[PDB]
Amino acid sequence: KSPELLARYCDSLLKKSSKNPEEAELEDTLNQVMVVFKYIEDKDVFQKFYAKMLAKRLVHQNSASDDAEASMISKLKQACGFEYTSKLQRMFQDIGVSKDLNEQFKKHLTNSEPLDLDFSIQVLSSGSWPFQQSCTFALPSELERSYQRFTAFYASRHSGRKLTWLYQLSKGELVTNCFKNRYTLQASTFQMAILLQYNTEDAYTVQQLTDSTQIKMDILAQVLQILLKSKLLVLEDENANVDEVELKPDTLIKLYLGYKNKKLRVNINVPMKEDRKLLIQAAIVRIMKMRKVLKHQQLLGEVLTQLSSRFKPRVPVIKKCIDILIEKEYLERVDGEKDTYSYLA
Amino acid sequence: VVIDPTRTISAGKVNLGAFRTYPKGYKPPDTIPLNKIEDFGVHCKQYYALEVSYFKSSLDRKLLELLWNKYWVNTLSSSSLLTNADYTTGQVFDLSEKLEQSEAQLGRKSEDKLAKATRDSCKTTIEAIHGLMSQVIKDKLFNQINI
């Protein structure tokens, strides 16, 4: 838990607050973090919660001092090694690549028929990010044309690549033309679709919104709850407490025409929220007895052949098993070759 | 004694080895090391391998040679000097090395290497002559019949 706490410290440090630490003192406190970092005996676990914390920091563009992010990973790379910071290097490079990609896309737009909205997208990458497409969603009629346009731009530039859009992590801004004044709210894609459904009629039932947006039940219920919290959708019984109201697919929710919030920058997009090791050791010692002298890669391949057919173990676990078996003086390294083991019983 | 059933079955010949070991912390005597650790364990210098030979009694020999018809047919067509020619060449090679060592020793621990080299030479020559005698007997038995 202490590693997690240190990593959350890191998160604050780099993320973003009302006060931005100067670049001089920002690296000063980062050096102190690395002073205690080497004292940490176990290094594998630190990368586990640092990956998801960093991914949320960058995908939402909530990171502060992205230059300090490059130096932070630079310090880590020389500390533990390339393999320990290989995944995080992909995350940073994807942000830099997509930032360049956005600039070229804007230039391509001017030379052709322009869009009707300011469109920006982070392309990310598959296999290196914890994100995955988990919620089905129907693309709104207003956010389709631009969609197609970008796909074309991503087909002429890159061939053989397929995009898998993540509407769960996509935000946006929506203007209004029917309120008392001109408002500009910020909401996720789900909330944008729900609020744009009311463009042609006044009141809809819950089922009429579920079958129009194809969002799953739990996420749709949560989005309706937060929208009701922002008093943007008004139920028939005003006096009923919103938290204890039980939602059913029969209530006729209508758009609140008389919305009169004083602030013109309403942000309703606020975020929410052992046994195997012995088996690997036995396989390693058996393979070492069968083959007296082996290389690290050949030993890994043999372990994968004999044992990975059962539960598909992770390579770092096997490497740690090799290290602990070395400490137990079960197999020794051979001088003259960095990766060579001899079964010394 | 260490046996290897898998290689015995897959090769057609028995894979066996007899070994003896040295006392604890005693006798550290001084391309060979690489293959030595490749086929032996890490403790190559901690134990040595005896030369394994087999024997049988007269009744056992008679029963075996009288068991199947494929044992006297394989004797009249054994064709030595060709089944194990490579072993003979290797014996001649290490005989030459032993003769060189004996020549070096006799020019100037106390083992009389010349006698052992002579015994090895007599042994290998005797196997060669035995093979030639088998070939001569086969030629006289089969080729010199019916004109």
Side-chain angles (χ1 to χ4, degrees), chain B residues 128-140:
Chain B
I129 303 169
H130 282 327
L132 181 63
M133 289 173 46
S134 283
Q135 299 274 127
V136 162
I137 283 169
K138 283 160 45 192
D139 174 68
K140 193 184 321 282

PDB file of all heavy atoms in Angstrom, chain B residues 128-140:
ATOM      1  N   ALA B 128      41.687 -56.489 -35.155  1.00  0.00           N
ATOM      2  CA  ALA B 128      41.758 -56.405 -36.615  1.00  0.00           C
ATOM      3  C   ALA B 128      41.995 -57.778 -37.239  1.00  0.00           C
ATOM      4  O   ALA B 128      41.334 -58.156 -38.217  1.00  0.00           O
ATOM      5  CB  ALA B 128      42.855 -55.428 -37.036  1.00  0.00           C
ATOM      6  N   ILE B 129      42.928 -58.548 -36.675  1.00  0.00           N
ATOM      7  CA  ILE B 129      43.223 -59.872 -37.214  1.00  0.00           C
ATOM      8  C   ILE B 129      42.053 -60.820 -37.000  1.00  0.00           C
ATOM      9  O   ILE B 129      41.802 -61.695 -37.831  1.00  0.00           O
ATOM     10  CB  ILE B 129      44.526 -60.433 -36.615  1.00  0.00           C
ATOM     11  CG1 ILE B 129      45.682 -59.471 -36.869  1.00  0.00           C
ATOM     12  CG2 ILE B 129      44.857 -61.777 -37.230  1.00  0.00           C
ATOM     13  CD1 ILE B 129      46.929 -59.806 -36.092  1.00  0.00           C
ATOM     14  N   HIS B 130      41.326 -60.678 -35.890  1.00  0.00           N
ATOM     15  CA  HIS B 130      40.130 -61.490 -35.684  1.00  0.00           C
ATOM     16  C   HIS B 130      39.095 -61.217 -36.766  1.00  0.00           C
ATOM     17  O   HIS B 130      38.474 -62.143 -37.303  1.00  0.00           O
ATOM     18  CB  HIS B 130      39.539 -61.218 -34.301  1.00  0.00           C
ATOM     19  CG  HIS B 130      40.262 -61.905 -33.186  1.00  0.00           C
ATOM     20  ND1 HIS B 130      40.871 -63.132 -33.339  1.00  0.00           N
ATOM     21  CD2 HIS B 130      40.464 -61.543 -31.898  1.00  0.00           C
ATOM     22  CE1 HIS B 130      41.422 -63.492 -32.194  1.00  0.00           C
ATOM     23  NE2 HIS B 130      41.189 -62.546 -31.303  1.00  0.00           N
ATOM     24  N   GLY B 131      38.896 -59.941 -37.098  1.00  0.00           N
ATOM     25  CA  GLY B 131      37.986 -59.613 -38.183  1.00  0.00           C
ATOM     26  C   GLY B 131      38.431 -60.202 -39.508  1.00  0.00           C
ATOM     27  O   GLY B 131      37.616 -60.740 -40.270  1.00  0.00           O
ATOM     28  N   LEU B 132      39.730 -60.115 -39.801  1.00  0.00           N
ATOM     29  CA  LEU B 132      40.230 -60.692 -41.047  1.00  0.00           C
ATOM     30  C   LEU B 132      40.054 -62.207 -41.067  1.00  0.00           C
ATOM     31  O   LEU B 132      39.746 -62.786 -42.113  1.00  0.00           O
ATOM     32  CB  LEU B 132      41.697 -60.325 -41.258  1.00  0.00           C
ATOM     33  CG  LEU B 132      42.271 -60.886 -42.559  1.00  0.00           C
ATOM     34  CD1 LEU B 132      41.543 -60.288 -43.748  1.00  0.00           C
ATOM     35  CD2 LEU B 132      43.760 -60.637 -42.663  1.00  0.00           C
ATOM     36  N   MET B 133      40.260 -62.866 -39.924  1.00  0.00           N
ATOM     37  CA  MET B 133      40.044 -64.306 -39.843  1.00  0.00           C
ATOM     38  C   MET B 133      38.587 -64.661 -40.091  1.00  0.00           C
ATOM     39  O   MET B 133      38.298 -65.659 -40.759  1.00  0.00           O
ATOM     40  CB  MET B 133      40.491 -64.829 -38.478  1.00  0.00           C
ATOM     41  CG  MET B 133      41.994 -64.827 -38.272  1.00  0.00           C
ATOM     42  SD  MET B 133      42.478 -65.264 -36.593  1.00  0.00           S
ATOM     43  CE  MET B 133      41.434 -66.687 -36.304  1.00  0.00           C
ATOM     44  N   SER B 134      37.660 -63.866 -39.553  1.00  0.00           N
ATOM     45  CA  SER B 134      36.246 -64.098 -39.832  1.00  0.00           C
ATOM     46  C   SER B 134      35.953 -63.968 -41.320  1.00  0.00           C
ATOM     47  O   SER B 134      35.231 -64.794 -41.895  1.00  0.00           O
ATOM     48  CB  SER B 134      35.384 -63.122 -39.034  1.00  0.00           C
ATOM     49  OG  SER B 134      35.280 -63.522 -37.682  1.00  0.00           O
ATOM     50  N   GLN B 135      36.513 -62.939 -41.964  1.00  0.00           N
ATOM     51  CA  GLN B 135      36.299 -62.773 -43.401  1.00  0.00           C
ATOM     52  C   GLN B 135      36.880 -63.941 -44.191  1.00  0.00           C
ATOM     53  O   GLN B 135      36.261 -64.419 -45.149  1.00  0.00           O
ATOM     54  CB  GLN B 135      36.901 -61.454 -43.877  1.00  0.00           C
ATOM     55  CG  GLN B 135      36.298 -60.230 -43.219  1.00  0.00           C
ATOM     56  CD  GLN B 135      35.047 -59.753 -43.923  1.00  0.00           C
ATOM     57  OE1 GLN B 135      34.000 -59.577 -43.302  1.00  0.00           O
ATOM     58  NE2 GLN B 135      35.148 -59.542 -45.229  1.00  0.00           N
ATOM     59  N   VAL B 136      38.067 -64.412 -43.805  1.00  0.00           N
ATOM     60  CA  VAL B 136      38.695 -65.533 -44.500  1.00  0.00           C
ATOM     61  C   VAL B 136      37.860 -66.797 -44.341  1.00  0.00           C
ATOM     62  O   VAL B 136      37.670 -67.560 -45.298  1.00  0.00           O
ATOM     63  CB  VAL B 136      40.135 -65.736 -43.992  1.00  0.00           C
ATOM     64  CG1 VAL B 136      40.638 -67.124 -44.349  1.00  0.00           C
ATOM     65  CG2 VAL B 136      41.052 -64.670 -44.562  1.00  0.00           C
ATOM     66  N   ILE B 137      37.355 -67.043 -43.129  1.00  0.00           N
ATOM     67  CA  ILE B 137      36.523 -68.218 -42.890  1.00  0.00           C
ATOM     68  C   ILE B 137      35.251 -68.149 -43.722  1.00  0.00           C
ATOM     69  O   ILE B 137      34.831 -69.145 -44.323  1.00  0.00           O
ATOM     70  CB  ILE B 137      36.213 -68.357 -41.388  1.00  0.00           C
ATOM     71  CG1 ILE B 137      37.426 -68.907 -40.640  1.00  0.00           C
ATOM     72  CG2 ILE B 137      35.012 -69.256 -41.170  1.00  0.00           C
ATOM     73  CD1 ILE B 137      37.299 -68.825 -39.138  1.00  0.00           C
ATOM     74  N   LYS B 138      34.619 -66.974 -43.777  1.00  0.00           N
ATOM     75  CA  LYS B 138      33.419 -66.824 -44.595  1.00  0.00           C
ATOM     76  C   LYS B 138      33.715 -67.052 -46.072  1.00  0.00           C
ATOM     77  O   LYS B 138      32.928 -67.706 -46.770  1.00  0.00           O
ATOM     78  CB  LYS B 138      32.808 -65.441 -44.386  1.00  0.00           C
ATOM     79  CG  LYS B 138      32.040 -65.297 -43.085  1.00  0.00           C
ATOM     80  CD  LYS B 138      31.876 -63.838 -42.700  1.00  0.00           C
ATOM     81  CE  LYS B 138      31.454 -62.994 -43.888  1.00  0.00           C
ATOM     82  NZ  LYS B 138      31.573 -61.544 -43.594  1.00  0.00           N
ATOM     83  N   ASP B 139      34.839 -66.526 -46.566  1.00  0.00           N
ATOM     84  CA  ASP B 139      35.203 -66.729 -47.965  1.00  0.00           C
ATOM     85  C   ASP B 139      35.437 -68.202 -48.268  1.00  0.00           C
ATOM     86  O   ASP B 139      35.001 -68.704 -49.311  1.00  0.00           O
ATOM     87  CB  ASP B 139      36.445 -65.913 -48.310  1.00  0.00           C
ATOM     88  CG  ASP B 139      36.949 -66.190 -49.711  1.00  0.00           C
ATOM     89  OD1 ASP B 139      36.256 -65.815 -50.677  1.00  0.00           O
ATOM     90  OD2 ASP B 139      38.037 -66.785 -49.845  1.00  0.00           O
ATOM     91  N   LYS B 140      36.128 -68.911 -47.375  1.00  0.00           N
ATOM     92  CA  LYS B 140      36.366 -70.333 -47.583  1.00  0.00           C
ATOM     93  C   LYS B 140      35.088 -71.153 -47.475  1.00  0.00           C
ATOM     94  O   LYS B 140      34.969 -72.185 -48.143  1.00  0.00           O
ATOM     95  CB  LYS B 140      37.398 -70.844 -46.577  1.00  0.00           C
ATOM     96  CG  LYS B 140      37.957 -72.217 -46.901  1.00  0.00           C
ATOM     97  CD  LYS B 140      38.900 -72.707 -45.812  1.00  0.00           C
ATOM     98  CE  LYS B 140      39.774 -71.584 -45.275  1.00  0.00           C
ATOM     99  NZ  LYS B 140      40.901 -71.266 -46.195  1.00  0.00           N
TER     100      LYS B 140
END
